[PDB]
């Protein structure tokens, strides 16, 4: 629950985070490192509650990401971080690194907001995931209920409508990014804060738009267990254990089970096609069209950011993929809209 994490400052870093964008702007790597050492000596993370460790992972993660921006592996330099992060990871049962959950919904609104830089373009990513994530999560719960409901039941269509409504939040989030974040300023000023960090022999990618649980929607709604060697399934496979634990069993189940649409494709061609059954199948295509209204503008944005003109020193997002990945997720989704449009043609 996000409001009880956002209000916490378990490492007393609030004043520091008002200095951070200037610290980062003047490349003051010594205050960064001095703060990491101070933390591993001023706090026994073992005594933390779950909410405390989640907010600590947010704050420590961003200081760590700021050191890695300059090119220094932060745990390699402050060796005592490794057991500190170990202990945080045990309490949270999440990666010893911040994700878009800590960057968005668990990031406080207003004066306490944790930001890497003074550029207003940064706000376009934070607001983007802070809006997207709550609505996808609600859609996730509602979409899971469609499996155990008949197309002919109005309850099916009302759940799918509520889910398409909640997914629109991700549209609102990506529209907020498109208006606030300059593709050039992002690549040159923001992107280098989301680079991999080596912690205990493993490398943990930085925060990413792709960490919003939208892929969980995908897996349950249309991907399921039908594209076993996809590159999309490998990304999801790599994402499962970055998600909060609450979401992992849904995602694992859905990867191992036929999708809602694939089953509802079957029930449709095997039952008395009533008027409610078509409304029900039309509410599935509504959800998918809401996904398209997100992926289409998202694609253009990453395309402008990664053009020769604006890409700066990168050719990939923080998860290591080019725009080819988004093109592939978008075509998957487009093709799903074509299959439903076909089932519905009469
Ligand atoms: C300048 C802004 C942005 C750029 C250049 C960008 C670019 C990318 C890239 C390159 C990927 C491939 C995965 C990776 O390597 O990280 C990706 C994936 C993804 N990103 Fe973005 N992104 C931006 C903003 C956002 C925001 C604000 C959100 C959420 C509100 C978001 C949501 C996603 C999602 C859901 C995926 C998974 C693929 C899909 O579902 O289409 N992105 N993005
Ligand atoms: O999603 C990506 O991989 C690139 C966009 C991106 C990097 N860090 C981010 C943090 C929050 C929201 C979006 C991003």
């Amino acid at each position: 629950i996000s409001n009880e994490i956002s209000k916490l400052d378990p490492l007393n870093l609030d004043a520091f985070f008002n200095q951070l964008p200037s610290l980062n702007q003047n490349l003051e790597v010594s205050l960064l490192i001095d703060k990491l050492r101070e933390i591993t000596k001023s706090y026994l993370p073992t005594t933390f509650s779950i909410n405390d460790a989640l907010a600590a992972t947010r704050d420590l993660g961003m200081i760590m990401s700021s050191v890695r921006k300059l090119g220094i592996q932060p745990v390699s330099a402050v060796s005592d971080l490794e057991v500190f992060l170990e202990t945080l990871s045990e309490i949270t049962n999440m990666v010893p690194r911040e994700t878009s959950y800590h960057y968005g919904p668990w990031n406080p609104i207003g004066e306490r907001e944790r930001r890497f830089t003074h550029f207003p373009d940064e706000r376009g990513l934070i607001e983007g995931v802070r809006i997207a994530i709550p609505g996808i999560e609600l859609a996730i719960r509602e979409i899971n209920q469609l499996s155990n409901l008949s197309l002919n039941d109005p309850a099916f269509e009302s759940l799918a409508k509520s889910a398409a409504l909640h997914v629109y939040q991700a549209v609102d989030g990506i529209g907020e990014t498109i208006k606030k974040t300059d593709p050039y300023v992002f690549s040159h000023e923001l992107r280098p804060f989301f680079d991999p960090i080596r912690i205990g022999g493993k490398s943990y990618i930085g925060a990413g738009g792709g960490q919003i649980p939208l892929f969980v929607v995908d897996v349950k709604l249309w991907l399921g267990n039908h594209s076993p060697n996809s590159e999309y399934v490998s990304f999801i496979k790599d994402s499962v254990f970055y998600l909060p634990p609450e979401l992992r069993p849904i995602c694992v189940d859905s990867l191992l089970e036929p999708s809602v649409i694939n089953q509802k494709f079957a029930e449709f061609g095997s039952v008395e096609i009533t008027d409610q059954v078509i409304k029900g199948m039309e509410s599935l295509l509504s959800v998918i069209q809401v996904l398209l209204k997100f992926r289409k503008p998202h694609f253009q944005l990453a395309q402008r950011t990664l053009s020769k003109e604006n890409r700066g020193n990168y050719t990939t997002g923080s998860a290591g993929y080019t725009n080819s990945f988004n093109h592939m997720v978008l075509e998957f989704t487009i093709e799903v809209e074509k299959q439903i449009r076909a089932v519905l043609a009469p």
Side-chain angles (χ1 to χ4, degrees):
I1 181 281
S2 94
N3 248 312
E4 284 180 314
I5 298 145
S6 63
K7 64 200 297 261
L8 290 174
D9 190 26
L11 307 167
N12 189 28
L13 285 163
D14 272 6
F16 186 85
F17 277 109
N18 296 317
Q19 320 307 135
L20 182 65
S22 156
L23 258 73
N24 271 339
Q25 178 224 286
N26 286 310
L27 311 193
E28 265 141 0
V29 60
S30 285
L31 306 178
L32 302 188
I33 309 267
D34 278 10
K35 190 45 88 170
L36 288 181
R37 300 179 167 139
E38 283 162 17
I39 291 166
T40 70
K41 308 180 192 158
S42 280
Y43 291 99
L44 309 132
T46 194
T47 73
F48 290 17
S49 80
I50 279 139
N51 290 352
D52 275 342
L54 291 165
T57 309
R58 169 203 62 216
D59 289 348
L60 200 52
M62 286 182 62
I63 304 171
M64 281 189 316
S65 285
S66 299
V67 169
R68 172 68 176 82
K69 176 248 169 168
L70 311 172
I72 288 147
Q73 276 295 337
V75 191
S76 296
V78 180
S79 82
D80 284 344
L81 264 178
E82 212 182 80
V83 310
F84 202 103
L85 295 168
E86 207 193 30
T87 288
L88 282 184
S89 208
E90 290 170 6
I91 294 170
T92 57
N93 201 25
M94 320 185 48
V95 285
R97 184 79 200 276
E98 84 277 31
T99 65
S100 286
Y101 269 85
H102 313 78
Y103 194 38
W106 303 348
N107 200 354
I109 278 146
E111 43 279 65
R112 290 182 66 252
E113 193 171 274
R114 277 91 167 100
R115 291 201 227 130
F116 290 113
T117 71
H118 61 288
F119 300 91
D121 312 57
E122 179 156 7
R123 251 193 82 181
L125 316 157
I126 290 166
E127 300 297 349
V129 292
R130 175 191 280 156
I131 294 149
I133 288 165
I136 300 163
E137 272 189 334
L138 281 147
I140 273 165
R141 297 339 180 115
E142 292 170 304
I143 289 181
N144 199 34
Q145 293 174 247
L146 299 170
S147 267
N148 274 36
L149 279 187
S150 177
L151 295 166
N152 187 74
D153 179 358
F156 179 106
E157 178 211 8
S158 305
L159 268 164
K161 279 201 175 155
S162 205
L165 191 52
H166 286 131
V167 172
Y168 256 112
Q169 291 263 99
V171 187
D172 302 333
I174 204 47
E176 285 311 300
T177 307
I178 294 178
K179 101 192 44 178
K180 282 187 155 103
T181 300
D182 173 69
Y184 185 93
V185 182
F186 167 81
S187 304
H188 288 264
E189 305 302 308
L190 309 183
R191 170 70 169 86
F193 287 94
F194 312 99
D195 272 339
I197 282 176
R198 207 65 156 211
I199 304 173
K202 262 143 203 274
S203 155
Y204 294 87
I205 63 164
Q211 303 175 326
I212 71 183
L214 198 57
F215 70 90
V216 183
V217 169
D218 281 325
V219 181
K220 171 32 83 202
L221 189 54
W222 58 263
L223 183 68
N225 63 8
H226 303 303
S227 309
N229 297 290
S230 186
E231 148 162 274
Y232 197 29
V233 166
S234 219
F235 168 92
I236 299 167
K237 178 242 289 187
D238 294 330
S239 302
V240 165
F241 287 93
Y242 281 70
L243 285 165
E246 303 81 331
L247 283 172
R248 306 187 187 156
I250 328 185
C251 190
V252 170
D253 293 359
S254 315
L255 280 165
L256 273 9
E257 282 165 8
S259 69
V260 167
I261 274 147
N262 160 278
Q263 304 148 23
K264 286 333 182 188
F265 269 1
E267 145 170 335
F268 191 94
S270 282
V271 300
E272 198 211 347
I273 280 142
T274 51
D275 266 358
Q276 189 60 71
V277 154
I278 289 174
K279 286 195 186 188
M281 177 80 55
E282 253 149 11
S283 62
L284 280 177
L285 162 78
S286 290
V287 181
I288 284 270
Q289 302 179 141
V290 183
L291 292 173
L292 287 177
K293 311 202 181 109
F294 165 93
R295 304 202 149 116
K296 279 162 171 189
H298 177 266
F299 182 80
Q300 294 312 319
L301 171 66
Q303 185 169 96
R304 303 192 296 282
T305 289
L306 295 163
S307 57
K308 282 230 190 53
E309 163 181 28
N310 301 311
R311 66 176 172 185
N313 292 322
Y314 292 84
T315 62
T316 53
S318 61
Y321 298 89
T322 79
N323 213 39
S324 308
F325 182 79
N326 300 319
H327 182 77
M328 173 229 76
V329 179
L330 178 58
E331 294 303 338
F332 266 129
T333 317
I334 282 168
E335 166 66 34
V336 164
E337 180 197 47
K338 175 206 196 200
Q339 294 202 334
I340 302 178
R341 263 164 180 188
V343 170
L344 271 200

